[PDB]
A paper describes a structure:
Bromodomain-containing protein 9 (BRD9), an essential component of the SWI/SNF chromatin remodeling complex termed ncBAF, has been established as a therapeutic target in a subset of sarcomas and leukemias. In particular, the bromodomain-containing protein 9 (BRD9), a specific component of the non-canonical (nc-BAF/GBAF) mammalian SWI/SNF chromatin remodeling complex, is essential to maintain the transformed phenotype of AML. Therefore while the BAF complexes regulate key steps in chromatin transactions required for cell fate decisions, including transcription factor binding and gene expression, the BRD9-containing BAF complex appears to play key roles in myeloid leukemia.. Paradoxically, the bromodomain in BRD9 has been shown to be an ineffectual drug target and degradation is required to reproduce the dependency seen with shRNA and CRISPR screens.
In this report, we describe a novel BRD9 bromodomain inhibitor, EA-89-YM35 (or EA-89), and a degrader-based analog (QA-68-ZU81, or QA-68) that incorporates the EA-89 warhead into a cereblon (CRBN)-targeting proteolysis-targeting chimera (PROTAC), to compare the efficacy of inhibition versus degradation to the impact seen with BRD9 knock-down (KD) by RNA interference. The binding mode of EA-89 determined by X-ray crystallography reveals that the thienopyridone head group binds to the acetyl lysine pocket similar to other known bromodomain chemotypes, forming a direct hydrogen bond with the conserved Asn100. X-ray co-crystal shows binding mode of EA-89 on BRD9 at 1.76 Angstroms making extended interactions across the surface of BRD9 with thienopyridone docking into the acetyl lysine pocket. HCT116 (colorectal cancer) was included as an out-of-lineage control, and JQ1, an established potent inhibitor of BET family proteins BRD2, 3, 4, was included as an inhibitor of bromodomain proteins with a distinct selectivity profile. The inhibitor, EA-89, (structure shown in Fig. 1A) produces a strongly selective profile across a subset of leukemia lines with no impact on the viability of THP-1, HEL, or HCT116. Interestingly, the degrader, QA-68, provides an >100-fold increase in potency over EA-89 and robustly degrades BRD9 in AML cells. We observed BRD9 degraders to induce differentiation of SKM-1 cells, in contrast to the BRD9 inhibitor, EA-89, which had little effect on SKM-1 differentiation and was less potent in inhibiting cell proliferation. As was observed with AML, the BRD9 degraders, QA-68 and dBRD9-A, showed higher potency against the B- ALL lines than the BRD9 inhibitor, EA-89.
Author numbering: 138 to 238
């Protein structure tokens, strides 16, 4: 693991702690959420981010932050504000960006 992979693995562990039930652990498919692909063109989840750290695909912390922000933005676009999905995405987006700053 390079120094960048080490820092990103730390940030991912800290972010995943805020999601104990794994709401963000897997890719959201149309079978799971009807019409998802018609609303969300670039899906993102913690599992895909973990594979990118392991494959050394993040050249900077900025790229990792963009995937994290995309995952949360997708949840806040597809889900209504009264839902658990939206509230958790908004809470983790703020906490996550505060922590990595
Ligand atoms: C949080 C952002 C990501 N994320 C995640 C889920 C979701 C789906 C299945 C889930 C879970 C969570 C959990 C904890 C367990 N499972 C079982 C799976 C686990 C993996 N292997 C298959 C079984 C949903 S579900 C939904 C929806 O149904 N949204 C509607 C909500 C009401 S609305 O009016 O907003 C229309 C959209 C929107 C999302 C969504 O964005």
């Amino acid at each position: 693991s390079t120094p960048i992979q080490q820092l990103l693995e730390h940030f991912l562990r800290q972010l995943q702690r805020k999601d104990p039930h794994g709401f963000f652990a897997f890719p959201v498919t149309d079978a799971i959420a009807p019409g998802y692909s018609m609303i969300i063109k670039h899906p993102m989840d913690f599992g895909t981010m973990k594979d990118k750290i392991v494959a050394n695909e993040y050249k900077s912390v900025t790229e990792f932050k963009a995937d994290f922000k995309l995952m949360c933005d997708n949840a806040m676009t597809y889900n209504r504000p009264d839902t658990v999905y939206y509230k958790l995405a908004k809470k983790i987006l703020h906490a996550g960006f505060k922590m990595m700053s």
